[PDB]
Coordinates of C-alpha atoms (C1' of nucleotides) and ligand atoms in Angstrom, one line a residue:
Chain A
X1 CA 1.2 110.7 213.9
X2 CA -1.0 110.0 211.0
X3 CA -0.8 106.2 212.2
X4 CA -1.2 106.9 215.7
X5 CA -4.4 109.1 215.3
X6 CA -6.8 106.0 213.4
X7 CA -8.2 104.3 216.6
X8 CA -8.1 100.7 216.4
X9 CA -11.5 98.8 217.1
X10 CA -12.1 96.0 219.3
X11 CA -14.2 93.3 217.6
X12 CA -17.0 91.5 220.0
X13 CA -15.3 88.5 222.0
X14 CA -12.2 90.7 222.0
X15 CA -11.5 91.5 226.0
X16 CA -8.8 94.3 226.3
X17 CA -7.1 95.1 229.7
X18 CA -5.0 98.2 230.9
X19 CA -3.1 98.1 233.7
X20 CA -1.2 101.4 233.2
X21 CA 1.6 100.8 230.3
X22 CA 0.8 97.2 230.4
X23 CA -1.5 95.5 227.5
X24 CA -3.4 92.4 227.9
X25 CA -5.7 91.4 224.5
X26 CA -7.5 87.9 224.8
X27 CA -9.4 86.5 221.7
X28 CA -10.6 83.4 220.6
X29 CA -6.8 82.8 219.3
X30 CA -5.0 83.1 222.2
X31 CA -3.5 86.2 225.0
X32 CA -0.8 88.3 223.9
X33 CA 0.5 90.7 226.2
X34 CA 2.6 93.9 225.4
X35 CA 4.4 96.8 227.5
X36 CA 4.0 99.6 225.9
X37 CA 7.1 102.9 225.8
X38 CA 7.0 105.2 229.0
X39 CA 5.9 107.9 226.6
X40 CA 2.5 106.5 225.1
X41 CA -1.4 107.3 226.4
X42 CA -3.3 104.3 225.5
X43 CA -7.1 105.0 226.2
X44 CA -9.9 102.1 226.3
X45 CA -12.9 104.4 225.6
X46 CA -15.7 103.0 223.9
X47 CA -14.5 99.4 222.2
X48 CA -11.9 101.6 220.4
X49 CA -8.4 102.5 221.5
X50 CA -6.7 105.7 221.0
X51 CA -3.1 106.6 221.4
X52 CA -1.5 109.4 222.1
X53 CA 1.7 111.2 223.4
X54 CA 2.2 112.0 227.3
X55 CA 3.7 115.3 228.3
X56 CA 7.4 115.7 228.7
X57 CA 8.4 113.1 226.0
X58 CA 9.8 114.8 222.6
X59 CA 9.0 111.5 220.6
X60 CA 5.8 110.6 222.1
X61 CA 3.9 110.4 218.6
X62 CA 6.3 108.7 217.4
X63 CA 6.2 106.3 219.9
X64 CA 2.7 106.5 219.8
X65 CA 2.5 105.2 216.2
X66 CA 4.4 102.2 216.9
X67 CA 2.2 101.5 220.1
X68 CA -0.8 102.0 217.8
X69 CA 0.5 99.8 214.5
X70 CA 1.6 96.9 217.3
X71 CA -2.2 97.0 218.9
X72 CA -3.7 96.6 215.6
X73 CA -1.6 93.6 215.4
X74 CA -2.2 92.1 218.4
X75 CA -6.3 92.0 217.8
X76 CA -5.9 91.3 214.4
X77 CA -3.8 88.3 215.9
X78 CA -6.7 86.9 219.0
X79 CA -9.0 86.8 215.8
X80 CA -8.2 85.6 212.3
X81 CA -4.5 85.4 213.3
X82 CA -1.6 85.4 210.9
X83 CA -0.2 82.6 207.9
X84 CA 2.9 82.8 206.3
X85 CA 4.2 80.3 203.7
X86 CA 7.8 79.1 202.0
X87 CA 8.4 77.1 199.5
X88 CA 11.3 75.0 198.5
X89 CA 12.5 74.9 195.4
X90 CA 15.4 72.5 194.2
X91 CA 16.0 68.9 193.3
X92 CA 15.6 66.8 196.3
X93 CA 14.9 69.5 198.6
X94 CA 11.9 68.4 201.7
X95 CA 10.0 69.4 204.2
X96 CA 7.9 67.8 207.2
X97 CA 6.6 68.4 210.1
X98 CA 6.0 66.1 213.2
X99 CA 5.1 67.3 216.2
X100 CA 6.5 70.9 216.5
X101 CA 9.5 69.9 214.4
X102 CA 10.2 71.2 211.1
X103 CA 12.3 68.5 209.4
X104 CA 14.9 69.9 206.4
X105 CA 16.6 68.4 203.8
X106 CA 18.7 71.2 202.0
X107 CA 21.3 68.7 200.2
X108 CA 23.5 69.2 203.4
X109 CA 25.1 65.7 204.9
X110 CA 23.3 66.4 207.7
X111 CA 19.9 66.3 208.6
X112 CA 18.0 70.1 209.8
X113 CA 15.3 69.8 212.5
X114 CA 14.2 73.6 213.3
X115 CA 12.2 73.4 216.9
X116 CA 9.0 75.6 216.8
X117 CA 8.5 78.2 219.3
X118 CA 5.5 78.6 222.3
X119 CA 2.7 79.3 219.9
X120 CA 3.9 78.5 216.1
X121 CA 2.2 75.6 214.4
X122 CA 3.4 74.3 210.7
X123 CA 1.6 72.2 208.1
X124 CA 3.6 70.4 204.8
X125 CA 0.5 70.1 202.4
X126 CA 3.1 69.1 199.7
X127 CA 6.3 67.9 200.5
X128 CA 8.1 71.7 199.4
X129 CA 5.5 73.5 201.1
X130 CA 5.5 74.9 205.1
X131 CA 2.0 76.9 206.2
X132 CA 3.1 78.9 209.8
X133 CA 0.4 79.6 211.9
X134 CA 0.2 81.8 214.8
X135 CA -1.3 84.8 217.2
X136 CA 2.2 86.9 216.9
X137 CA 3.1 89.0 214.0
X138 CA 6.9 89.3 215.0
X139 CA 6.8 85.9 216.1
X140 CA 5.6 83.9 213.1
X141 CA 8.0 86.6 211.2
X142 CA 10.9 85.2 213.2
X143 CA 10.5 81.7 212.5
X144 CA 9.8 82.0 208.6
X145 CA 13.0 84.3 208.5
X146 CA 15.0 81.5 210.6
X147 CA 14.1 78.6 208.1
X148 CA 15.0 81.1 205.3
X149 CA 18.1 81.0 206.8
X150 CA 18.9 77.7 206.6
X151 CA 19.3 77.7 202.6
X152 CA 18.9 81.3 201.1
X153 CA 17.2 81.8 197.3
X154 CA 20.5 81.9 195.1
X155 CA 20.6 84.2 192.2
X156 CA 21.4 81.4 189.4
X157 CA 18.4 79.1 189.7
X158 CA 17.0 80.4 192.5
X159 CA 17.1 77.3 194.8
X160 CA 16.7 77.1 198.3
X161 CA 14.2 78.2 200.8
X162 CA 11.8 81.3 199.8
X163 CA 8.7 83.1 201.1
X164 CA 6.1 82.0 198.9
X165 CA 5.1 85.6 197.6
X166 CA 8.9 86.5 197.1
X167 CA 10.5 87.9 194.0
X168 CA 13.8 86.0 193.4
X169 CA 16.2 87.9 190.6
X170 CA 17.9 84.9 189.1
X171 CA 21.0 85.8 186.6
X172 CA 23.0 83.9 184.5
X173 CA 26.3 82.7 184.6
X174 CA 29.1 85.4 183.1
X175 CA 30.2 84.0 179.4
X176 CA 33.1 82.8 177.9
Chain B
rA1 C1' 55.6 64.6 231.5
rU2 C1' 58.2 60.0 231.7
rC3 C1' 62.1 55.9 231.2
rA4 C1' 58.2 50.4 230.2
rC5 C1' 60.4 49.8 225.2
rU6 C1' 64.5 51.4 221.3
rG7 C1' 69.0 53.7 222.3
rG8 C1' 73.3 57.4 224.1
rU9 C1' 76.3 58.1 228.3
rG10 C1' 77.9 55.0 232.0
rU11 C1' 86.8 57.5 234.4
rU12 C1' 82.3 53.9 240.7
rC13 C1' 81.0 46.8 237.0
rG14 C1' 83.4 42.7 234.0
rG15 C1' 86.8 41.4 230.3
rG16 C1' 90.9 41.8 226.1
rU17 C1' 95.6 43.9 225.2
rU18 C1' 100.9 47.1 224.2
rG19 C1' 105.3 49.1 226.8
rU20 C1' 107.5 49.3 231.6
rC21 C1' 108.3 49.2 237.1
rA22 C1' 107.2 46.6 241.4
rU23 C1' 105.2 42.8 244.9
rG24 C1' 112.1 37.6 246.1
rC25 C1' 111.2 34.3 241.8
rC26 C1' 107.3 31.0 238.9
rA27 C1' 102.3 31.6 238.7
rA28 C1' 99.2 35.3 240.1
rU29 C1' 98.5 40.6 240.7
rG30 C1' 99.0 46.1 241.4
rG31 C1' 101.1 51.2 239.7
rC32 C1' 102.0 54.5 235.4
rA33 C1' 101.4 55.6 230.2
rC34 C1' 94.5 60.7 227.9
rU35 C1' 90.2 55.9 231.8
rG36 C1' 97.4 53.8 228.3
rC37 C1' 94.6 51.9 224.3
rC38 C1' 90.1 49.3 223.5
rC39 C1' 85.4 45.8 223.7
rG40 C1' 80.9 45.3 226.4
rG41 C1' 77.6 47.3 230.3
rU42 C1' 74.1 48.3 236.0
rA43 C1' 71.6 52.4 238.3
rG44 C1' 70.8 57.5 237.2
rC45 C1' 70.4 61.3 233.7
rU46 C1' 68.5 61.4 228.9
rA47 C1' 66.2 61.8 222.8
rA48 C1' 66.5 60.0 218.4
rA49 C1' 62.4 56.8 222.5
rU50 C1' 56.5 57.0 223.8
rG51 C1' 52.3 58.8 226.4
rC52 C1' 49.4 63.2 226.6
rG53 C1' 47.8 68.4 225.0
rG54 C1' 45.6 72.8 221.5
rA55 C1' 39.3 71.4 222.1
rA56 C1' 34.0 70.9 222.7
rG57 C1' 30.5 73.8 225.3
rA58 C1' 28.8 78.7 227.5
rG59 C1' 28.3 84.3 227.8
rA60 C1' 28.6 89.1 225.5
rU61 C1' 29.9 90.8 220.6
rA62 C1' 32.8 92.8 215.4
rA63 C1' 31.8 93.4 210.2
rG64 C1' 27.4 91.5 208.5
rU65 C1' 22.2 89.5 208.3
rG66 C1' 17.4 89.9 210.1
rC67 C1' 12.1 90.2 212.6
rU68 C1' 8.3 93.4 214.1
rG69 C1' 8.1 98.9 213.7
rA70 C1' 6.7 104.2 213.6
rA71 C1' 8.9 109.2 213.1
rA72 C1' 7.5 110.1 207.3
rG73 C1' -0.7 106.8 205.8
rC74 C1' 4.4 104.2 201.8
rA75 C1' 9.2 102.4 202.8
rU76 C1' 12.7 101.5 206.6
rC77 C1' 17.3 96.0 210.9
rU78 C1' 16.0 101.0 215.0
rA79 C1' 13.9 105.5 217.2
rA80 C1' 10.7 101.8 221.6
rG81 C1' 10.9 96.2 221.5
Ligands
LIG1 K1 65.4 54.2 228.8
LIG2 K1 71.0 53.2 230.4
LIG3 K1 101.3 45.9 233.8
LIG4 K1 10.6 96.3 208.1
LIG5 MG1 64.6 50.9 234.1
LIG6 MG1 73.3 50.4 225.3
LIG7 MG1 82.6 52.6 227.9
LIG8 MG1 105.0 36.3 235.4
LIG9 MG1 105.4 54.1 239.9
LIG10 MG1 106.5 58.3 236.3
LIG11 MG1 33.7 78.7 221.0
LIG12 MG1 5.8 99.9 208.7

RNA sequence: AUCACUGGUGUUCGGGUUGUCAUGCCAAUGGCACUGCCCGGUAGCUAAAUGCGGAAGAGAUAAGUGCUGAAAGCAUCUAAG
């Protein structure tokens, strides 16, 4: 509703394309592509789109808000794109990249290579540092969550793999 | 599953031996006595013998964990995806 009513602009060099519930953005980042719900009117107008709800569909601003927040993604992507960044924290814990291959050592007694999807790219500046980089909001989400994954922040020293703006709640151990 | 090995069985293979009857007798043999009683043992069957098995992988999930995400300007694993 409220969402779904602020048009999202189109910056110059951003090309949009309709081809009925079908999205095509193009920037200087890359082409993402989205198919929007059976129940969302997306309008081109005048380097702006609007969204709103087609007739017969009892949640089409909701689904309009959703198709509007995802839009506004996907040109905010072809443009300055998104970053996220983890950091490791614990003794002898490392990270490097080569190629599209994250390499892991979490103190397991084996070694963790995490493949990078289509259109992810990761940096190490220091060795418990990763910098994603990528066109695709869910998709760079993905891919931070997934090497979370592979060592969790535990709540006693909080060691492990975090998002670098994270809040980790340590506690200490019971006495006695 | 199998019998190469280790073994069991092995009244159809060989031997020892008690009592007695017979083959004229000696010598040699056979019958009967739980296979007379025993000692070994071939093939086969067999376990205690010795080979092998339970999986890996894939698909769709449970509880659970998430990503992006509005309805509800926030938040939210969910309503779409
Ligand atoms: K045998
Ligand atoms: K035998
Ligand atoms: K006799
Ligand atoms: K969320
Ligand atoms: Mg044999
Ligand atoms: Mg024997
Ligand atoms: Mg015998
Ligand atoms: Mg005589
Ligand atoms: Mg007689
Ligand atoms: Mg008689
Ligand atoms: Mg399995
Ligand atoms: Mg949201």
């Amino acid at each position: 509703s409220r969402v779904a009513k602020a048009p999202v602009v189109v910056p110059a060099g951003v090309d949009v394309k309709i081809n009925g519930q079908v999205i095509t953005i193009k920037g200087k980042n890359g082409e993402l592509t989205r198919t929007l719900n059976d129940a969302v009117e997306v309008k081109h107008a005048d380097n702006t789109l609007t969204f709103g709800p087609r007739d017969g569909y009892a949640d089409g601003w909701a689904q309009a808000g959703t198709a509007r927040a995802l839009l506004n993604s996907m040109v905010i992507g072809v443009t300055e794109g998104f970053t996220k960044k983890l950091q490791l924290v614990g003794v002898g814990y490392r990270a490097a990249v080569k190629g599209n291959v994250i390499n892991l050592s979490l103190g397991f007694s084996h070694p963790v290579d995490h493949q990078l999807p289509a259109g992810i790219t990761a940096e190490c500046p220091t060795q418990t540092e990763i910098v994603l980089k990528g066109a695709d909001k869910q998709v760079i989400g993905q891919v931070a969550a997934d090497l979370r994954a592979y060592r969790r922040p535990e709540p006693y020293k909080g060691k492990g793999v975090r998002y670098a703006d994270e809040v980790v709640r340590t506690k200490e151990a019971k006495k006695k």
